[PDB]
Amino acid sequence: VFHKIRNEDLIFNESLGQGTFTKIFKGVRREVGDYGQLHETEVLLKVLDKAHRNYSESFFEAASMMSKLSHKHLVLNYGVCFCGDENILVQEFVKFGSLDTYLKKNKNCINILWKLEVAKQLAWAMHFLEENTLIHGNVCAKNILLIREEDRKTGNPPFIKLSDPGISITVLPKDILQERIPWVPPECIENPKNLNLATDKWSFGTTLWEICSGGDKPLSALDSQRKLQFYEDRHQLPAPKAAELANLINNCMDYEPDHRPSFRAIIRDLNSLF
Numbered sequence: 001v002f003h004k005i006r007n008e009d010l011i012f013n014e015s016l017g018q019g020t021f022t023k024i025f026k027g028v029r030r031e032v033g034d035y036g037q038l039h040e041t042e043v044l045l046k047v048l049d050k051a052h053r054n055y056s057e058s059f060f061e062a063a064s065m066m067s068k069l070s071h072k073h074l075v076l077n078y079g080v081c082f083c084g085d086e087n088i089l090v091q092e093f094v095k096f097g098s099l100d101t102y103l104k105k106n107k108n109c110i111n112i113l114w115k116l117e118v119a120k121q122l123a124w125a126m127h128f129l130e131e132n133t134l135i136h137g138n139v140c141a142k143n144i145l146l147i148r149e150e151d152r153k154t155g156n157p158p159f160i161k162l163s164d165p166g167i168s169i170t171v172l173p174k175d176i177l178q179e180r181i182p183w184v185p186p187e188c189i190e191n192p193k194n195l196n197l198a199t200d201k202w203s204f205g206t207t208l209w210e211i212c213s214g215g216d217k218p219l220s221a222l223d224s225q226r227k228l229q230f231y232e233d234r235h236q237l238p239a240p241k242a243a244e245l246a247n248l249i250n251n252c253m254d255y256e257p258d259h260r261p262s263f264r265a266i267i268r269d270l271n272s273l274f
């Protein structure tokens with residue numbers, strides 16, 4: 001169970017927008033830290049409506065199951081606040097935000113070594129979840145958070161974490177599912193109960209495509225009906241102009257779930273591309 005945080009000790013500041021049936025805010029948590037020292041900590045607050053009981057139960061279950069698995073590349077959740085008007089997940093605030101924005105804002109500067117490092121780190125996170133047989137369900141660049149920028153001056157590669165899973169694709173409306181083509185794999189579009197570890201392999205592929213496409217979203221030009229038809233006709237994504245990961249993207253995004261490679265194999269492939 002999550003550590004419970006008092007309503008009183010959270011201040012909501014700026015809106016960072018809306019996610020899938022969530023409102024996101026930057027905030028401050030008043031806390032007694034190590035050594036009984038009082039702290040006021042920058043936090044990310046994810047807000048679910050109490051009235052959507054099924055959605056928040058799914059949201060908070062998923063967040064909890066993953067938070068039981070501490071890892072350097074998985075986002076830290078400090079706890080929850082349910083004593084209020086709403087249900088709130090209190091999470092670490094990640095200084096450089098989402099990868100998808102960052103890729104767009106710094107497209108001109110990001111090169112292949114940076115891309116490789118970030119792909120490697122995501123692959124290691126996904127390896128860890130695979131070993132723990134925990135399905136994330138919502139891997140996309142948006143949900144990669146940049147803890148630390150690259151510093152060439154000093155040799156530091158960037159560092160990333162993968163955010164919490166959100167509401168399960170088993171409980172989300174069909175209409176949201178179709179909107180998330182091509183991250184949601186074809187087998188989950190025909191039946192979301194086909195959700196499986198193989199799901200995350202497909203989405204990982206889609207995320208690599210984003211990582212190589214400067215913040216572009218695959219198939220954004222296509223409406224929901226045409227996205228559905230794209231899977232029905234078994235299309236693949238175009239190779240990015242930066243083609244270095246094109247083969248890995250296609251191998252990952254295999255219409256046969258059984259044939260998608262393990263994350264160990266994905267890591268060895270990434271390592272070899274040096």
Ligand SMILES: Nc1ncnc2c1ncn2[C@@H]1O[C@H](COP(=O)(O)OP(=O)(O)OP(=O)(O)O)[C@@H](O)[C@H]1O
Nearest residue numbers: 016018019020022024044091092093094097098166
């Ligand atoms: N831990 C975090 N630190 C800093 N910024 C964050 C964090 N988590 C999310 N954000 C920012 O909040 C905004 C909304 O995030 P997002 O759309 O992922 O919400 P969400 O509730 O996680 O939805 P979904 O389940 O669709 O991912 C984005 O600008 C993103 O960069």
Ligand SMILES: [Mg+2]
Nearest residue numbers: 019142143163
């Ligand atoms: Mg998210």
